[PDB]
Amino acid sequence: GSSGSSGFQPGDNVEVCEGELINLQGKILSVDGNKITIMPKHEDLKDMLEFPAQELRKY
């Protein structure tokens, strides 16, 4: 099998620092190199989203 590429790992709780989706917290699902696919914690939203490591920040 595999272990885990070098970088950030999904599952941790992070939030957006800059951008339009600022002040947006949520859990990480996976890590796509420069892009990070996660899912925001909001009822209004019923789907997952992907943001750049730059937009997302670990708090």
What does this entry show, briefly?
With 59 residues, this protein is mainly beta. Helices cover 0% and strands 36% of the residues.
What number of structural domains do the residues give? 1
Q: Helical region count?
A: 0
Structural class: mainly beta
Number of strands: 5
User: N- to C-terminal separation?
Assistant: 31 Å
Strand fraction band? 35-45%
Q: What is the CATH class designation?
A: Mainly Beta
SSE order, as H and E?
A: EEEEE
Q: Do you know the CATH architecture? A: Roll
Can you tell me the CATH topology? SH3 type barrels
Global shape: globular
Integer-rounded radius of gyration:
11 Å
Subcellular location: Nucleus
Domain KOW: 8-39
Protein name: Transcription elongation factor SPT5
Family: Belongs to the SPT5 family.
Describe this structure in words.
The protein is an all-beta fold and 59 residues long. The protein has a single domain, classed as SH3 type barrels (Roll), CATH 2.30.30. The protein has strands spanning 13-16, 25-28, 35-40, 49-52, 56-58. It is globular. 10% of the residues are buried. It is found in: Nucleus. Residues 8-39 form the KOW domain. This is Transcription elongation factor SPT5. Belongs to the SPT5 family.
